Write a protein that binds this ligand. Structure first.
Ligand SMILES: *CC(=O)NCCNC(=O)CCNC(=O)[C@H](O)C(C)(C)COP(*)(=O)O
Lengths: 61, 485, 487
């Protein structure tokens, strides 16, 4: 669909249901490597630096 | 310059807090049991509350449990000292942690992501505390041996005296996870088959395995008095030396210990016949115990009208071999605060090689009150030859906050239990409220209770769980299993 | 209270001593080669166990890092003009920073536990020298050596130590460590360290060690020792609340530099060189350059020369700080600046012109005293900076006839070298008689000219104190290493 937050499982929170929106990536845990990986994981569907929460990240798509 | 000790935290077998440790020591109970599928082992070493520190579960899985344990101990120590961690950001706070085991790395390597490098190095043990607390002071890990914790404490005291650090965190940690460490230790043949530490006893055959951690907050006495902090103790002087030219590298030397004791008592302004207790480093071995006894008798036993009381904490929890010094310092501080001397187990017949009557020393095997200030000494001798000694003297509506609802109810229940405990009955409810409102950080979730009596407040706290400064029962974490797979 | 450095020793790829290191640096060569990518030593399984009275089985179970540290300490003591036999029962402190224990991993694929402890790396020295000073091993990361040096200096200032041995070591023997390093994503694919360059894509692995001798400047002057340098101040701090636990911070480095140049009393625009900690990465290099420009770049009428030794031997991560300190001391002694390799164009993220910095890519004489700074940033976020200024018949002995002939050969070769031509033969004899210890097997040569003495030395390759002068350096000792590896 539009949100399809199924690639967040890279954070290790079991199924992609425990991941919460309207948050900050630095609080839940996101370094440069995970940020780059998540940016490159959206090829199958600024954009992340200025969009901490996954909600604004999915707002682009 | 004296150093003011204002707060401490510890995690030991059968002792999850200073109150539990005091109860265990005063009751004469031994925590050395069998391996949970001999030695003192902690409970659920694989459980950690990664959400509190903002660490992803994937990172925590490869994280060294020692680092998480030290982080929890530091948080507990800063909470119990009445200092808000949020006020320690952008400050020159020093961290001194002494560790000498990395068995988690061996377990990972015997049988590859980017977290392995960050989670399997000894420096990150203190670097994570520095990152979490935002400390601008020096942070490093010293590898000394059995006296690493005391070396770290001495380094913290020296740094405070120099003036480059205003608040220091000193202590140690050790965990026995891999059986490889046990196999190499048994290869040396220094383990007593009886599984007990017979310190200063004729049945001494070696030491027993032990694990745990401890941390303490060190500040200058002048600054502590200026800030009005509650002082647990006063460290007078410390020194670190090496045996040097002994018969064997493993074999300790009496002359070095004598010189260290003389020099540490010379600069501390402490004369014989006024030291009420000395913490022994003896691990129930028939080699170093007579040497330590002879050194103590030559230094402190000479020219004393009454025998010097001595004892060790390794008879209860075992030789932690990475945190023995900090454990002994914590025990001495607790004894000074309570003005009582806990008994020492495993002492029935005096060692024939140790002339206790001639050395004017006696092993404390009975709980007795402490009377005169009171001065105590903690000694830690490393296996390689490093020796350290620390001299400590005695000091001259309720709001509950947590980051989770279950955590909030657990905090409320623990606070109610502590209030119902006789330890918390010596403080007025106004003092408890002031400590909760000023000495505790405010989290996302909070609850407020009110009443006209302590019993009513406790009842309300239990129902929802379904000005002087006083201590509080630290923080209740929500630990979750995090292990490699 | 300034500290006096009166001697140093090092073991680096293609550099077995200070003279070899200076020759390699001045010639602008690189020791980074292929795996027999990164700087490597000739052999690491060779040791002279008979010199230290160590059993062959113990040497086989011995950690090679311990043996290398012991040899480096012995070499530093021999080159410092102090007789080790007179250092027994003295307050001599040892501070060695190590962060690698791959030998334990090799063993885990009674002597085993003694040869696999990181603390003993220092403690064994206290056993060998019979010293009563503190002996601890500090684990900090990439700045362990500088932290140990600062701790030794502070201990000397306090007064609990008389002579200190400060340094570090790092050896890469296990392929597992290389595997984790590659998985982390920091190894340069090209196998080169481009410091402050536009091609920066990581660092290169390197193995080696270093040690220096630290003494009180007043006490050294009273004794009359040969002062190699004067350390003025040293500070250790942490980055605290940075963006990432691995990512360094610029404000912390700026504050550390400010405090270390204010405590030492060295104002800007009089520092002639700065030893960079650049790892050839486009992340920390801009931060370090910005910090240097904000602290030292401002208020300077000339560009500040900067350079890093990692362009010659690669990153060591256990002895980088001591290697940089040794390089700075050598530059101060020779009053010359060695060029920096792997530098073609400035990094776009690094405004060298705006930051008032320039990379020393040529061999030029050093002119004004001369002040240098050495920086070391740890992986966890610990930063250290050290400020160092410049100082204001022949008898041969050995424990074996082969060792005696080897020592005679090296001494004759050093005498034939232009470095040894600046010392009179009487001074050489006095240094051999007083600054060297008489071993079991000793020989005495006689001659009326330097050429005759050299020829006699090659041919064969008593209170001598009252026989004779100043103190001059000698080519240390000729070891007879033997293979000792676990099976
Ligand atoms: C000895 C030592 O510490 N060596 C590494 C020094 N490294 C640096 O100065 C650069 C730090 N690099 C990074 O943090 C990388 O960018 C990471 C690890 C890939 C994270 O990148 P992200 O923060 O963009």
């Amino acid at each position: 669909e539009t949100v399809r937050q199924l690639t967040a499982h890279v954070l290790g929170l079991t199924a992609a249901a425990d991941v919460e929106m309207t948050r900050s990536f630095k609080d839940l845990g996101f370094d440069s490597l995970m940020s780059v990986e998540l940016r490159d994981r959206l090829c199958a569907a600024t954009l992340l630096y200025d969009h901490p929460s996954p909600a604004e990240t999915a707002e682009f798509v | 310059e004296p150093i003011a000790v204002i707060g401490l935290s510890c995690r030991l077998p059968k002792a999850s807090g200073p109150q539990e440790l005091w109860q265990l020591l005063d009751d004469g109970a031994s925590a050395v049991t069998r391996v949970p599928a001999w030695g003192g082992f902690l409970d659920r070493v694989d459980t950690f509350d990664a959400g509190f520190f903002g660490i992803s579960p994937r990172e925590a899985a490869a994280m060294d449990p020692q680092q998480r344990l030290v982080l929890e101990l530091s948080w507990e120590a800063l909470e119990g000292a009445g200092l808000v961690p949020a006020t320690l950001r952008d400050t020159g706070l020093g961290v001194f942690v002494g560790a000498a085991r990395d068995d988690y790395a061996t377990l990972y390597r015997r049988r590859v992501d980017h977290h392995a490098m960050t989670g399997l190095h000894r420096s990150l043990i203190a670097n994570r505390i520095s990152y979490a607390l935002g400390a601008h002071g020096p942070s490093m890990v010293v590898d000394t041996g059995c006296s690493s914790s005391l070396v770290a404490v001495h380094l913290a005291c020296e740094s405070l005296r120099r003036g480059e650090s205003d608040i220091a965190l000193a202590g140690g940690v050790n965990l026995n996870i891999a059986a490889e460490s046990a196999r190499e230790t048994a290869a040396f043949g220094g383990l007593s088959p009886d599984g007990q530490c017979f310190t200063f006893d004729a049945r001494a055959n070696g030491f027993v395995r032990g694990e745990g951690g401890g941390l303490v907050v060190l500040k200058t006495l002048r600054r502590a008095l200026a800030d009005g902090d509650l002082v647990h103790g006063v460290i007078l002087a410390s020194a670190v030396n090496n045996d040097g030219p002994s018969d064997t590298l493993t074999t300790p030397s009496r002359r070095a210990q004598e010189s260290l004791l003389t020099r540490v008592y010379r600069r501390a302004g402490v004369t014989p016949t006024e030291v009420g207790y000395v913490e022994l480093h003896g691990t129930g071995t028939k080699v170093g115990d007579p040497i330590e006894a002879a050194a103590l008798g030559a230094v402190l036993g000479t020219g004393r009208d009454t025998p010097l009381p001595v004892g060790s904490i390794k008879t209860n929890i075992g030789h932690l071999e990475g945190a023995a010094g900090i454990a002994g310092l914590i025990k001495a501080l607790l004894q000074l605060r309570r003005r009582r001397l806990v008994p020492s187990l495993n002492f029935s017949t005096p060692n024939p090689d140790i002339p206790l009557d001639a050395l004017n020393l006696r092993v404390q095997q009975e709980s007795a009150p402490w009377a005169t200030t009171l001065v105590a000494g903690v000694s830690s001798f490393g296996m390689g030859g490093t020796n350290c000694h620390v001299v400590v003297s005695a000091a001259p509506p309720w709001v509950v906050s947590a980051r989770s609802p279950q955590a909030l109810r657990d905090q409320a229940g623990r606070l109610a239990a502590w209030a119902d405990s006789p330890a918390g009955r010596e403080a007025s409810p106004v003092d408890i409220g002031w400590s909760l409102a000023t000495s505790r950080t405010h989290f996302e979730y909070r609850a407020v209770v009110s009443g006209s009596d302590r019993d009513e407040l406790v009842a309300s706290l239990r129902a929802l769980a379904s000005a002087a400064r006083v201590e509080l029962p630290t923080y209740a974490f929500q630990r979750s299993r995090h292990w490699l797979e």
